[PDB]
């Protein structure tokens, strides 16, 4: 599948793409405002994620730090990033279908639209000012709005026992972005698309 990753934000982001134990395509790239990066993701990929990183510094070997979304200090991410990160999530060619969603389970840093560029299903978006409205206890100094599991490490927020309900903190993310997952057991906002669809991820879609 092809994913076009577009930075419509007025600031530079460092896109990242991983399936947790490996990079997708090159795994990461700087996107200045307006830039687009096209990657190719192997069919059948399960559990892929794309996210933005902010305020990064890399040396000539691709090593450094980012204030949000850092993936072990690498420009080309092999691993998932440190919260807070708005996440585009996807599993491709799963019994004939692709499954996409946006998640706030690991917090929010940059607004996002995740839409097919081929026929057959709708896109999803989380474009509210979550960072501006973020509850005080969830604000991340580097930027961004952490999820409650990251901040408080309780069984209820992290849904460790497989039972857990919505919380004051999950409801905040859900109020502002009802089409994104707000906690692990949220009612699914996954979209089913035809297998082998192509997609566009746009950071700051309403910019
Ligand atoms: Na998230």
Contact 85, 146 (CB under 8 A): no
| CA 149 – ligand 1 centroid, Å | 11
| CA 176 – ligand 1 centroid, Å | 14
| CA 53 – ligand 1 centroid, Å | 12
| CA 146 – ligand 1 centroid, Å | 9
Contact 148, 170 (CB under 8 A): yes
In 3D space, the residue among 126, 122, 125, 103 whose CA is nearest the CA of residue 197 turns out to be 122
Contact 106, 201 (CB under 8 A): no
* DSSP letters spanning 96-155: TEEEEEEE-TT-BSS-EEEEESSSSS--EEE-S-HHHH--GGGB-TTSSB--HHHHH--H
Q: 3-state DSSP: the chain helix, strand, coil percent, rounded to 5?
A: 10, 40, 50
| CA 64 – ligand 1 centroid, Å | 22
| CA 86 – ligand 1 centroid, Å | 4
- Six-digit token pair at 133? 């409205």
| CA 180 – ligand 1 centroid, Å | 9
* CA–CA gap between residue 12 and residue 6 (Å, rounded): 11
Give, as one character, the DSSP assignment of residue 172.
H
Torsion sign over Cα 175, 82, 48, 53: positive
β partners of residue 125: 113
Q: How was this structure determined?
A: X-ray
**Checking phi first, is residue 205 left (phi over 0); if not, alpha (psi -120 to 50) or beta?**
alpha
| CA 147 – ligand 1 centroid, Å | 8
| CA 108 – ligand 1 centroid, Å | 6
| CA 33 – ligand 1 centroid, Å | 22
In 3D space, the residue among 149, 150, 151 whose CA is nearest the CA of residue 137 turns out to be 151
Contact 198, 120 (CB under 8 A): no
| CA 106 – ligand 1 centroid, Å | 3
**Checking phi first, is residue 76 left (phi over 0); if not, alpha (psi -120 to 50) or beta?**
beta
Residue carrying structure tokens 């698309």 = 193
- Six-digit token pair at 199? 């997609």
| CA 18 – ligand 1 centroid, Å | 14
Torsion angles phi and psi, residue 121, rounded to 5: -160, 175
* CA–CA gap between residue 135 and residue 132 (Å, rounded): 9
| CA 102 – ligand 1 centroid, Å | 8
| CA 31 – ligand 1 centroid, Å | 20
Please name the residues in contact with 136: beta carbons below 8 A apart, sequence gap of 6 or more.
none
**Secondary structure of residue 204 in the 3-state scheme:** coil
* CA–CA gap between residue 199 and residue 190 (Å, rounded): 15
| CA 104 – ligand 1 centroid, Å | 3
**Secondary structure of residue 33 in the 3-state scheme:** coil
- Burial tier of 108 (Cβ tally within 10 Å: 0-12, 13-18, 19+): buried
């Amino acid at each position: 599948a092809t994913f076009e990753i577009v930075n419509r934000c007025s600031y530079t982001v460092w896109a990242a793409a991983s399936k947790g134990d490996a990079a997708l395509d090159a795994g990461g790239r700087q996107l200045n405002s307006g830039e687009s990066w096209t990657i190719n993701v192997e069919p059948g990929t399960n559990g892929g994620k794309i996210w933005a990183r902010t305020d990064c510094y890399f040396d000539d070997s691709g090593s450094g730090i980012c204030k949000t979304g850092d993936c072990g200090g690498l420009l080309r991410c092999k691993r998932f990033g440190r919260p807070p990160t708005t996440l585009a999530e996807f599993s491709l060619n799963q019994y004939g279908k692709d499954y996409i969603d946006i998640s706030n389970i690991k917090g929010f840093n940059v607004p996002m639209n995740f839409s097919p560029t081929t026929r057959g299903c709708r896109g999803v978006r989380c474009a509210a000012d979550i960072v501006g409205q973020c509850p005080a206890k969830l604000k991340a100094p580097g930027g961004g709005c952490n999820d409650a599991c990251t901040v408080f490490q309780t069984s209820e927020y992290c849904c460790t026992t497989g039972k857990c309900g919505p919380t004051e903190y999950s409801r905040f993310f859900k109020r502002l972005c009802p089409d994104a997952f707000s906690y692990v057991l949220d009612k699914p906002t996954t979209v089913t698309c035809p297998g082998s669809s192509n997609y566009r991820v746009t950071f700051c879609p309403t910019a």
